[PDB]
Amino acid sequence: GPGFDFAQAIMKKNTVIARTEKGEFTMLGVYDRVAVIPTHASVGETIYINDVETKVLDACALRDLTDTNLEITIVKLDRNQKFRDIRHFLPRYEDDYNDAVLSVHTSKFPNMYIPVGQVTNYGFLNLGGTPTHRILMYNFPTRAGQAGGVVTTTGKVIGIHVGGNGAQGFAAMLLHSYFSDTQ
């Protein structure tokens, strides 16, 4: 179906397996050598990208106007391969959505596709003790190891998975404005 075709294409061309000291994460490549990863991955000065030691040229843990964690870290990678530019698939504002898919790919969870259904946005989530803003919630019982998983709808890349409470899953919202690249 159309949703799954889109999630599969995003997985096909715009993800890598990232590995920090904290373990494996699904990593979404956004454009050029810029990718995102949940902030609790604790990205260092180097990171394994599909098992290749890759220097980190920059790592920026995003925080909003309120100096509040957004749980996305934007990473610039020292590698020759260039990500296809999917910034046009990113929402421009916070929204709700229907029929979302959570797509994960790691060694532990290879090629995982979960139709999580309706997604609702919130301004708030206390994430393992850290206040966090701009969160998408889906009523599905996600599990540790899916962090960084990409959430999509037909034609939109809307968030990356950051955590869960046993019954619900939470994603950090992706906004086009994050990747404005205006110094």
Residue numbers in the entry: 1 to 183
Q: What do the authors report?
A:
During viral replication of EV68, the viral genome is translated into a single, large polyprotein comprised of structural and non-structural proteins. The viral polyprotein needs to be cleaved into individual proteins for viral replication to proceed. The 3C protease cleaves eight sites in the polyprotein with a preference for a glutamine–glycine (QG) motif at the P1/P1′ positions. The conserved essential function in viral replication makes the 3C protease a promising target for DAA development.
We also determined a high-resolution apo structure of the inactive C147A mutant EV68-3C protease for comparison. The C-alpha distances between the two structures were calculated and the average for each residue mapped onto the two structures (ranging from 0 Å to 1.5 Å). The largest variation was observed around the active site, at the P1 binding pocket. In the apo structure, the areas surrounding the P1 glutamine binding pocket form a narrow and more open channel. With the apo and peptide-bound co-crystal structures with a viral cleavage site of the EV68-3C, we were also able to characterize the large conformational changes that occur upon substrate binding.
